[PDB]
Design an enzyme around this catalytic site. Structure first.
Site, PDB file in Angstrom:
ATOM      1  CE1 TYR B  15     -35.273  86.804   4.787  1.00 24.46           C
ATOM      2  CE2 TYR B  15     -33.679  86.759   2.843  1.00 24.46           C
ATOM      3  CZ  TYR B  15     -34.912  86.140   3.465  1.00 24.46           C
ATOM      4  OH  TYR B  15     -35.454  85.168   2.815  1.00 24.46           O
ATOM      5  CG  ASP B  39     -38.856  81.927  -2.345  1.00 21.13           C
ATOM      6  OD1 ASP B  39     -38.567  81.316  -3.422  1.00 21.13           O
ATOM      7  OD2 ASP B  39     -38.025  82.311  -1.399  1.00 21.13           O
ATOM      8  CG  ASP B  96     -26.795  81.749  -9.057  1.00 20.96           C
ATOM      9  OD1 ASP B  96     -26.047  81.744  -8.191  1.00 20.96           O
ATOM     10  OD2 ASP B  96     -26.448  80.922 -10.007  1.00 20.96           O
ATOM     11  CG  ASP B  99     -35.129  87.410  -1.841  1.00 20.03           C
ATOM     12  OD1 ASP B  99     -35.185  86.480  -2.740  1.00 20.03           O
ATOM     13  OD2 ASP B  99     -34.979  87.212  -0.567  1.00 20.03           O
TER      14      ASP B  99
END
EC number: 5.3.3.1
Lengths: 123, 123
Positions: B15, B39, B96, B99
């Site tokens: 990914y 997100d 930074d 996930d």
């Protein structure tokens, strides 16, 4: 109050400080009285300060350090990367872990989840 | 099948590879057709491949790299630390992020949550 993003960074950094020195009583006090912990994530959670104190007493010569900055959101959640170094039966090992924590309206850890498995162990 | 801990590490590393090169079509295909993305976490989720492709097309000169190993569990979940470098209106910045992803019984990303806020930005 519900920790801000900056406060979440400070609280989570403190948590690693406490784990590093091994102050079990100070660690347990960071949690809400009825908090749940899922360490490692996938395992059933432990609930309440009593079970949490037992868990830490059992788990804690161990040193822990943040291996990157604490990522924090605006809704009382944070995630951080860290490493734990121990000595498993004479042999010293390390574990890379990522903790995700949600704080409550009082600045206490309401829920904690730890991500790691054997793929993150170096023995 | 439900990715094992080792498979989760490989999928999540892939990914970041895709995000780094900017292959939007390959990224979108890693997701389940009805996946949700939050997100940054705290913001309302986007659902389905269409909205996800739009999100990535909008977001993607960007380079991303894992800044630590992928932490993976045995129940199809993983968490990873990484940095994204971009150039915000002439000025280059870095972010930074951490996930957290859950994969389905087919090895596709069922849900993705990204932890970061302005405290994780360097501009």
């Amino acid at each position: 109050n519900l920790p801000t993003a900056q406060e979440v960074q400070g609280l989570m950094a403190r948590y690693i400080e406490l784990v590093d020195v091994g102050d079990i009583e100070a660690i347990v006090q960071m949690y809400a009285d009825d908090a749940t912990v899922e360490d490692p994530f996938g395992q059933p959670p432990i609930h309440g300060r009593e079970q949490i104190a037992a868990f830490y007493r059992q788990g804690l010569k161990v040193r822990a350090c943040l291996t990157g900055p604490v990522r924090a959101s605006h809704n009382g959640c944070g995630a951080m990367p860290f490493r734990v170094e121990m000595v498993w039966n004479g042999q010293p090992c390390a574990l890379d872990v990522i903790d995700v924590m949600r704080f409550d309206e009082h600045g206490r850890i309401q829920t904690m989840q730890a991500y790691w498995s054997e793929v993150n162990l170096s023995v």
